[model samples]
Target: QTSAVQQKLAALEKSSGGRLGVALIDTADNTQVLYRGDERFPMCGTSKVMAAAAVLKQSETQKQLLNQPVEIKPADLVNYNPIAEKHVNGTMTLAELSAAALQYSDNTAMNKLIAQLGGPGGVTAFARAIGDETFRLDRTEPTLNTAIPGDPRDTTTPRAMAQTLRQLTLGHALGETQRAQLVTWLKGNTTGAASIRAGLPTSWTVGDKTGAGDYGTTNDIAVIWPQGRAPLVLVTYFTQPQQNAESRADVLASAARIIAEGL
Candidate 1:
């Protein structure tokens, strides 16, 4: 079964003129499918999910932290910060900042959250705490999106990402409320319309985070609830070497379709 899917994905990669990475885990049977699952891919904005989880984890120990207001400074603002820009020089609750980062992919909101977690190392710490040694975040946004070839900074393998996401959402990495909050924010994501969500059938429900960067990188990591089946943790990371090349969401969609069919 795995070989068939692997062959199809290889063909897709060749035809599309890009490298494709995927990791699909069926929570019900513990089955897995992988294509370059251990290779690094840029995290891009998708790191917001991990940052949000770190904040929520801290809240578990520090009472009322989520409700605490976080002041947004003008200096915090960066490119592509639609939601956070509106609140510059103002304030938003830590929870609100998480939602903005996750739902809107707001760079400023993400940076603020990263600061709250003690910078990139803190986020990486959270991942390590949850048994994912392969996850890493070496920088904040914009610079993180640089996606320099062969640079391991701010990158993760499809397997590492899928495993961490599963632990947070389906395992005990987060408190029940925090887990649900993460899922809700992911479900409300506005940037993944052309990716995995677009390929999934309407009958199934999905919550996902998207990422894009230089070198034609476009990614989506998701927990999909297909009706009548146990949930699946799916990840797709696509990239090509051409600088400023078009990041193809269609590749992600097509990969999602194949994964769904194989399952």
Candidate 2:
């Protein structure tokens, strides 16, 4: 028999026009609901958290400074994101750059941080350290060439990303200060209001990361707090090869509503 969550998602899938990998987890009891939870999709900008985690981990050893300032050259600019277009010719502290990547999904800022941790290799290592085995980072943004079909520059399953978010939220593999800083950036993120955030009830609070890619790839990972219940972690991805971003975002919001109440 189809569960309530499954029924809600099935109706959504019939209208959503493409396949989506989705998962909702209860952080309190670890209960889970999944749809294509193991299917890997491009992490795209969502992997910025991994990059940020790498820097925060480095800070633990006194090797990196969160407040260190760095300049943004014109060469660093990448199309399609506001940070590159608006602030690519100035200077900001490492803390600010990380927040820009998270809050605005800034590719240039993410790339700089990715490079700082020795590129994709470093990011992948950090992911593994945090107990996520399915995530792999191999390319930077704005330079999508050599990006393999169905296998993007960075990739992860919905289940994998949920675990990563859970660990990050719970302060695993990171100092309390670093974890607190990372969560603050995620909560302050100004993007994705049209998607997962839209689905949730106005009373709920969320800190999330959003990702967009070609071929209708839209992804969101969030930590949601109910008014008086344990927090729920939701990860969703849509690959609507024939749909628009608005459609996918709406689907995500619908999914969020279903999981939030049904779980």
Candidate 3:
């Protein structure tokens, strides 16, 4: 049985000079897979997705209100300070800030929001509470001290994210109500810029994140047509002396499109 998915992937890889990393899982049949370079590679900005989970956990346990206003103070931020500047210049709820970070991938706002939520500790708490031991939420930068401690380049796997989104899509990372909020927020998130969202079927709904380094590292993770079609998870990461930029972007996008066709 020939698959267009395999052929499309072959085309994508061939066009890339035969160097692309890929991995995908179809939840409907419980399929798991991988390709070269799909493993951990200092992913950044992407941590917000997990951070969102942590905040929701806090909301559930402490009864925090996402709808309530959260004051944004710019001085409390570092690493992508623009986000804080925007929030301080304006007012957004905890939900708004989190959504801003999720959708826009706003760095300053994210760091500030994480500081308020208790930073890495808050993220760790969410990880522990959710019983997902795989993701390490350390500072993407170690020397920096703030509520969000750990390397800005925290390491994670698509398999872990697959479960994480399942939790979010299903609500509360463990319940139905939180799940609704997670999906709504994720769908509303248009921050990621490229990859999975770009090639998705006009009818396909995507919930995910995109990441890159100024020096040429790239990555993305999310569920596609998650509820209806195969409920697949796609994770792709690639690097070069300098990312093959356009081709690199094409490769990453091609991988998810492959999975979409497979469905």
Superposed model 1: Cα runs more than 4 Å off: none
Q: For each candidate, what is the lDDT? A: 0.90, 0.79, 0.61
State which candidate, 1 or 2, has the greater lDDT: 1
What are the clash counts of all predictions, listed in order? 0, 0, 20
User: Can you write out model 3's per-residue Cα lDDT over 1-263, one digit (the tens) per residue?
Assistant: 43566566657767765344555766677776655423444446666777776766667755666776767665545555434466564677778777777777667656645666676667756776776666666663322212121234466655665566666664346455666777777777665446777666767777777665543456677766743665666766554443343325656776776666646
Regions of candidate 2 where Cα sits further than 4 Å from its true position: 84-89, 144-149, 242-247
How far residue 118's Cα lies from its native spot in candidate 2, in Å, is 0.8
Whole-model alpha-carbon lDDT for candidate 3: 0.61
**What TM-score does model 1 achieve against the real structure?**
0.97
Kindly give the stretch of ten consecutive residues in candidate 1 with the minimal lDDT sum. Answer: 1-10
TM-score of each: 0.97, 0.91, 0.78
Winner by lDDT: 1
After TM-score superposition, what is the CA distance of residue 31 in candidate 1 from its true location, in Å? 0.8
Task: Return the TM-score for candidate 3, rounded to 2 decimals.
Answer: 0.78
Model 3 spans > 4 angstroms off: 1-21, 36-38, 77-84, 89-91, 140-153, 226-230, 243-248
